[PDB]
Amino acid sequence: VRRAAVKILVHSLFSMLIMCTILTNCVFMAQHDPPPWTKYVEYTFTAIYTFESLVKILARGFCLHAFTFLRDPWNWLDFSVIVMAYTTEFVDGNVSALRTFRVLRALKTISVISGLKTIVGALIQSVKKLADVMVLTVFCLSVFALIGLQLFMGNLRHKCVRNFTELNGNGSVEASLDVYLNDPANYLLKNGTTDVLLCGNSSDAGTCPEGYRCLKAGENPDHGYTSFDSFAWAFLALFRLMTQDCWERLYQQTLRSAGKIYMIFFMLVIFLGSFYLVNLILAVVAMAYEEQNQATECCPLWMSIKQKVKFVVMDPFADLTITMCIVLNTLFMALEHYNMTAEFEEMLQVGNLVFTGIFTAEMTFKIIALDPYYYFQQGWNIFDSIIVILSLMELGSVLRSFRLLRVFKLAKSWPTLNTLIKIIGNSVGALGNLTLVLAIIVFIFAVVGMQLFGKNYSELRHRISDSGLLPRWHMMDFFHAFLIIFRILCGEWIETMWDCMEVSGQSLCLLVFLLVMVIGNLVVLNLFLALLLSSFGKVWWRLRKTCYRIVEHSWFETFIIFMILLSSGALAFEDIYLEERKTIKVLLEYADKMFTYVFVLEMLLKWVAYGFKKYFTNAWCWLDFLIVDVSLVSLVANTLGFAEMGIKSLRTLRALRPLRALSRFEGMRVVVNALVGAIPSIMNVLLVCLIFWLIFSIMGVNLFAGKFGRCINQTEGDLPLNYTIVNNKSECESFNVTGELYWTKVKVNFDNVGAGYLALLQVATFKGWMDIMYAAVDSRGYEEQPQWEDNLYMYIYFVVFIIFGSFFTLNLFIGVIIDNFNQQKKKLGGQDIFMTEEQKKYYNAMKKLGSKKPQKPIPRPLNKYQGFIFDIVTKQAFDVTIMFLICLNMVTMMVETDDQSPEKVNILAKINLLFVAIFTGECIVKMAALRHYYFTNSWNIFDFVVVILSIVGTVLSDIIQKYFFSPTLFRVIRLARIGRILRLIRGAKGIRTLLFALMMSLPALFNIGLLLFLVMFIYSIFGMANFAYVKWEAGIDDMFNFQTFANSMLCLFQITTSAGWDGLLSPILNTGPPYCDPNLPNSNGSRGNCGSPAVGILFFTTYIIISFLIVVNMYIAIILENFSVA
Ligand SMILES: *[C@@H]1O[C@H](CO)[C@@H](O[C@@H]2O[C@H](CO)[C@@H](O[C@@H]3O[C@H](CO)[C@@H](O)[C@H](O)[C@@H]3O)[C@H](O)[C@H]2NC(C)=O)[C@H](O)[C@H]1NC(C)=O
Ligand SMILES: *[C@@H]1O[C@H](CO)[C@@H](O[C@@H]2O[C@H](CO)[C@@H](O)[C@H](O)[C@H]2NC(C)=O)[C@H](O)[C@H]1NC(C)=O
Ligand SMILES: *[C@@H]1O[C@H](CO)[C@@H](O[C@@H]2O[C@H](CO)[C@@H](O)[C@H](O)[C@H]2NC(C)=O)[C@H](O)[C@H]1NC(C)=O
Ligand SMILES: *[C@@H]1O[C@H](CO)[C@@H](O)[C@H](O)[C@H]1NC(C)=O
Ligand SMILES: *[C@H]1O[C@H](CO)[C@@H](O)[C@H](O)[C@H]1NC(C)=O
Helix, strand or coil: CHHHHHHHHCCHHHHHHHHHHHHHHHHHHHCCCCCHHHHHHHHHHHHHHHHHHHHHHHHHCCHHHHHHHHCCHHHHHHHHHHHHHHHHHHCCCCCCCCCCHHHHHHHHHHHHCCCHHHHHHHHHHHHHHCHHHHHHHHHHHHHHHHHHHHHCCCHHHCEEECCCCCCCCCCCCCCCHHHHHHCHHHCCECCCCCCECCCCCCCCCCCCCCCCEEECCCCCCCCCCCCCCCHHHHHHHHHHHHHCCCHHHHHHHHHHHCCHHHHHHHHHHHHHHHHHHHHHHHHHHHHHHHHHHHHCCCHHHHHHHHHHHHHHHCCCCCHHHHHHHHHHHHHHHHCCCCCCCHHHHHHHHHHHHHHHHHHHHHHHHHHHHCCHHHHHHCHHHHHHHHHHHHHHHHHCCHHHCCCCCCHHHHHHHCHHHHHHHHHHHHCCCCCHHHHHHHHHHHHHHHHHCHHHHHHHHCCCHHHHCCCCCCCCCCCCCCHHHHHHHHHHHCCCCHHHHHHHHHHCCHHHHHHHHHHHHHHHHHHHHHHHHHHHHHCCCHHHHHHHHHHHHHHCCHHHHHHHHHHHHHHHHHHHCCCCCHHHCHHHHHHHHHHHHHHHHHHHHHHHHHHHHHCHHHHHHCHHHHHHHHHHHHHHHHHHHHHCCCCCCCCCCCCHHHHHHHHHHHHHCCCHHHHHHHHHCCHHHHHHHHHHHHHHHHHHHHHHHHHHCCCCCCCEECCCCCCCCCCCCCCECCCCHHHCCCCCEECCCCCCCCCCCHHHHHHHHHHHCCCCCHHHHHHHHCCCCCCECCCCCCCHHHHHHHHHHHHHHHHHHHHHHHHHHHHHHHHHHHHCCCCCCCCCHHHHHHHHHHHHCCCCCCCCCCCCCCCHHHHHHHHHHCCHHHHHHHHHHHHHHHHHHHCCCCCCCHHHHHHHHHHHHHHHHHHHHHHHHHHCCCCCHHHHCHHHHHHHHHHHHHHHHHHHHHHHHHCCCCCCHHHHHCCHHHHHHHHHHHHCCHHHHHHHHHHHCHHHHHHHHHHHHHHHHHHHHHHHHHCCCCCCECCECCCCCCCCHHHHHHHHHHHHHCCCHHHHHHHHHCCCCCCCCCCCCCCCCCCCCCCCHHHHHHHHHHHHHHHHHHHHHHHHHHHHHHHHHC
16 A cells, blocks of 8 residues: 555656646635535545545655654645644634635645745745845935935825814814814815825925915824834835835825925935836845856649649748738728728728738638648648638627737747747746746735725725725625736735725735735746846138137037026026016027027137038037027027017927937036937837737737727716616717716827827826726727626736736837847947946046055054053954944834823933944044054044034034924934934945945936936926917826926926826817817916827827936946945
């Protein structure tokens, strides 16, 4: 039997039955509300498992042998789940927690598979390599959280109410804090949205109207999970701004409490926190992964007829024509839209039949004329014939979905689309089994939530979904829980974590959402990166001499730089309040006139200097000429008529003025040279994404076109009734007796391949799919009003799309950028781009500053008692003792909140005095270390300066007490304390390498972000002239706008992080009533509170693509310096 035990164990069929058993148990777990019948079934499963529990142990047939077998980690899962089932069969008390653990039986899928255990053993390796990075990011987030703790102590909590605190209640009258927190029906709701509008003391925060007073005292943050006080909450908020998830909303709320200035903080953070930390995580994961992969019916009749048709075969000569016919098929299907003319659609079906007959006849002749057995052989022609069969099925909704599948043969004449095909192959091939891990992991968490939250999801529903109904993302089902796990895999958690916490409870909801975020994102990361790696007279001459001496000299250069900077500032003063001061209005008029004159002058000078050949040889000189010609047209239209009708068309192009800056600056021009190097590598990938999105957009047209339109009667703004009030756009007309009802399509939808491309961008950017998916699935019929969830499985479209549309397209994109950039490092005269000659020098000097072989250790004082001082000092003990002292200081610095209690205030002040006393003592002992500690190590000058500064703090506090009290400066006075903790960089060597690498790569990053600043400038003035007077919508508030240049710069800043651009686009794209009405009374001549959809999409899409290219360049600079460190 023991012999029989083994000879059944190694038997393969036994393990395959095990695997199928596991999967069936899985499907029988996934159910919610399990019928009681099914209940008996689970008994059986236990038996099955337990029976092997026999075989496994019985293959050992011995005590020590069976314990050696259990000694394996994977079989521990079997032992545990089987004994759990046994004890549950024995006795129940049962709080239903025991019903959840049955999910881990899924992990047995890992150790039954020959590679799953291998892959998951591979994963834990990269996370252990991620050790130093994890330490740096937690310390960095703690530092920034202390910054934000002292900066925004309860600062978020400010709200606007009606006026209170009137007179002699003594405080209990409104018409103390009790009724004030009871007030929220008094809170000033952010118009058109569900939000209490913040405010602040500063003359920058969100300002309330008449009838409202602004006071910090508020009930709570948005749901208590945002706030910056209570350092744990600040750690959460800075976690999200490290992940940038919904970071725009916290950005808005902060800058509507505190004031716009503090945005510096955010960009600092978003330059350090999100950007840099995430990029390092990327770098280390990729490095460890590449390492791991490196470690790895008559005779003459038959003859004559075969040879006649062979003579036919002698000239196919239709392949390019057939390819054009395929492209014409795709086009013919593409000229499809919402309201198609009758005879139009008749012709379209006509051509449908045309193309079908064409390809069907072609295949019918080819398969018979070349070889039936060969067309049995080559699978390519086989799949062509498959699509033939599918066309036949259509001819003799979804019936169209296959007609597209031919475009892919282009991949043989088009190599990079073959590369996309190889990529999606590796998504199932080389690393494809890795993807199974993802599956399983999703499958685990996909259910681990519902049984923990779904029941709760099912009952406090009024807490999580305001519109009384199921929420848009619940977990009660298993589809919806797959969608939550998916969205979280898409880096968008906290906006559903607030839900999960507001239903059930903080502890477990955290433990599961942080778990899914970290775990699943690490897996998605390893997959992403595995893909990226598997993708691998004489007076004439005299005057000319004067001219060279003029223009080549530093004085003219610096003067022209001063001119161009003043012209850029001129542009910057094109705000909407020019009318507010008349003087500046003619001031800038004369300014512009001087600019035109000096620039045409220097144009002439360059002309005679180089002559037209060397002049128009330069592209930058070409650009300068184009701009100056625009200015010439402008000035002549000013002087000699011909204006005010239609160069008011060429009027705004003046905003491109700063485009002259790139030529003369040493840092912009070089990275711009780099980007023109990326156009030959981005055009092809743009075209690949163009085709590979045209497919999906056609598909969404077939399934979707027209169905999106629903919107509303002008009463509310939210989609109409499915019960109904209206089902039909031809049934709302019977109610349009009053125009209050509007049947409008959603601002971005599938009515073309154009708006299809737009909705596909908004989806695969993840910022603004909400209305897309919602009004996509909810829709049922071609013009049937969307029933609240019907056709619900159409999420499967986006999901499928999203995978490609993000994890391959973007993937492939990044791919070609690397090699190109990689190849750019080869033939370039240098090894790393983005560094000027002087910047190369500076980087080499900064690196030589990284000397690890030290100098002479220390001069002994020879003073006996100073010898004892030395004997206690230069040892490692005193250092780590001081280190624990500074860490206890750290925790002293974490505990504080706002308005804690006066006793706590005094206690913490006294503890600060205690610690600074400690540090003065250490400072005097250090200045007397031997003699020279004040200059032997910069790590000691740091301690000296922080001691003196700490002393300055206490004295400053005393001065504030005795002579005067300031308001926010007081806060800075109490602020520099964080510097103390920074010594850890002295202790920490890993962080001392990482932030050092950041310093190393700060030059190239300065250049790239400088170009970024210039582009923000161009676009911000571009909008200030173009995007003015737009209506307020959800993304475009009162403060983040385009009215001035500051607000424009703040908006375009957030959009520099590809965030919010949905919410800023939606107020632009809109056209016509109700929201947009007779254009506007504008102080400017340009009328309209409305946006221009053409140029709106142009502006925002182009900013996204450009800024995204600059940002990828930033990322690659970071990573290349990272590798050059090691
Ligand atoms: C911006 O900060 C100012 C502080 O200058 C806030 O005004 C002050 O608000 C407090 C209440 O929160 C007032 O205190 C009250 O006055 C009596 C006077 O005897 C005081 O004894 C009590 O403590 C009582 O709470 C304080 O008088 C008031 N200052 C003035 C001159 O009205 C202001 O509310 C802040 N703005 C916002 C947006 O809340
Ligand atoms: C348009 O909406 C109307 C009202 O919802 C529907 O028109 C029909 O509704 C009546 C009432 O039940 C039925 O008797 C007819 O049979 C319906 N028409 C058809 C063609 O079945 C219907 O929902 C929509 N009809 C059209 C043509 O769009
Ligand atoms: C019902 O009909 C009225 C009259 O057309 C609609 O009101 C106008 O809708 C158009 C749509 O572009 C706008 O251009 C006009 O500005 C609207 N007029 C107003 C009120 O100023 C109304 O929208 C229609 N409602 C339905 C049934 O969709
Ligand atoms: C909010 O909207 C109302 C609607 O008329 C408007 O009057 C008010 O100025 C707006 N205020 C803010 C802060 O958006
Ligand atoms: C509210 O009323 C008080 C007292 O009249 C006034 O000082 C304050 O400016 C008002 N604020 C509002 C309603 O904007």
